[PDB]
Enzyme design. Structure first.
Site, short mmCIF file in Angstrom:
data_model
loop_
_atom_site.label_atom_id
_atom_site.label_comp_id
_atom_site.label_asym_id
_atom_site.label_seq_id
_atom_site.Cartn_x
_atom_site.Cartn_y
_atom_site.Cartn_z
N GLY A 94 0.82 -1.19 0.00
CA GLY A 94 0.00 0.00 0.00
C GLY A 94 0.87 1.25 0.00
CB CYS A 148 -3.29 -3.35 -0.66
SG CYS A 148 -2.97 -1.58 -0.29
CD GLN A 161 -3.34 -0.14 -8.66
OE1 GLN A 161 -4.44 0.28 -8.31
NE2 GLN A 161 -2.31 0.66 -8.91
CG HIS A 187 -9.06 -1.72 3.52
ND1 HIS A 187 -8.46 -2.44 4.54
CD2 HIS A 187 -8.53 -0.47 3.58
CE1 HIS A 187 -7.60 -1.66 5.17
NE2 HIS A 187 -7.62 -0.47 4.61
CD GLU A 216 -10.95 -2.34 7.42
OE1 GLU A 216 -11.84 -2.48 8.28
OE2 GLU A 216 -10.40 -1.24 7.17
#
Length: 193
Positions: free
Chosen positions: A52, A79, A83, A170, A172
């Site tokens: 990140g 994260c 991509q 995300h 989490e």
């Protein structure tokens, strides 16, 4: 053993702790701290690419790692690793149709890959980011998860023939009970011969 590439991120501690509860040993590096050569010497059983901050960012991280170990070691990208997987296989990273409001999304899926047998939809939390472009998605990638709100965006990809998956939500979200099942699914995957 799991080799995890992050960027000294705040979510990494929680993921490390849960992976130990699954009886897995983790070694964490930033991308500048280990080479492809030294990754091969360590012979990890799984790679998690989760660098990140999880923010809108055109950069692709650990691109050479992902390309090199594609078809050698199973790879999970979270994260910016999501991509980065998309880019490594020819995908385009673009801005989303709408700015997302709030922090949560309902993530619908087709029971493929790491979403196998998960509740549909998957409740997750989100960050602001660019997204993998649906209209130009490479032939070797398949969409596994998506949102319906707004005009929708890709939330999960997988390689059609290699054990490589990216999820857009995300990190989490991995620590929820259904997130626990998603990660378990990843750890089952083995590279072919």
């Amino acid at each position: 053993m799991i080799l995890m590439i992050d960027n000294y991120d705040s979510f990494t501690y929680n993921l490390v702790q849960y992976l130990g509860e699954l009886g897995e040993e983790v070694v964490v590096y930033r991308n500048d701290e280990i080479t492809i050569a030294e990754i091969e010497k360590l012979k990890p059983d799984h790679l998690v690419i989760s660098p990140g901050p999880c923010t809108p960012n055109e950069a692709g991280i650990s691109l050479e790692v992902i390309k090199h170990f594609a078809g050698k070691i199973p790879i999970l990208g979270v994260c910016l690793g999501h991509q980065s997987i998309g880019q490594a296989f020819g995908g385009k990273i673009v801005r989303a149709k709408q700015v997302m409001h709030g922090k949560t999304s309902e993530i619908y899926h087709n029971n493929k890959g790491v979403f196998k047998g998960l509740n549909n939809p998957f409740e997750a939390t989100r960050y602001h980011s660019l997204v993998v472009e649906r209209e130009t998605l490479p032939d070797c990638l398949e969409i596994t998860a998506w949102t319906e709100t707004d005009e929708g965006e890709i939330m999960g990809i997988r390689h059609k023939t290699l054990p490589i998956e990216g999820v857009q939500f995300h990190p989490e979200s991995i620590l929820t009970e259904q997130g626990h099942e998603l990660l378990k699914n990843f750890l089952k995957e083995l590279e072919h011969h």
